[PDB]
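About this split. The held-out portion is used to measure sequence recovery: a designer receives only the structure tokens and must propose an amino acid at every position. Recovery is the fraction of positions where the proposal matches the reference. Here is one held-out target exactly as it appears in the evaluation file.
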């Protein structure tokens, strides 16, 4: 992929690692939050967004769940690419 794909990963995590309740539910939501507005004028952006909060969130959050950084996930998770 190599594109905004990573960004998104930095949207879920950024929301996860920096949430407040540590809710992977309200975390993946936050993502689609801006992922929508931030990328409201993106082709399939908002589409993939929701397709990310529930597809690359369970895993992404999985890493940070074990003790991984938000800069380590988007790499070993072969998600960034």
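Reference sequence for scoring:
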């Amino acid at each position: 992929r190599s594109a905004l794909s990573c960004q998104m990963c930095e949207l879920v995590v950024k929301k996860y690692e920096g949430s407040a309740d540590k809710d992977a539910n309200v975390i993946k939501k936050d993502f689609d939050a801006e992922c929508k507005k931030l990328f409201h004028t993106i082709p399939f952006g908002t589409r993939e967004c929701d397709h990310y909060v529930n597809s690359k969130v369970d895993p992404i959050i999985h890493e940070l769940e074990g003790g991984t950084a938000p800069k380590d996930v988007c790499t070993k998770l072969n998600e960034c690419p």
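Annotator remark: Residues 1-81 form a domain with the NK-Lysin fold (CATH 1.10.225.10).
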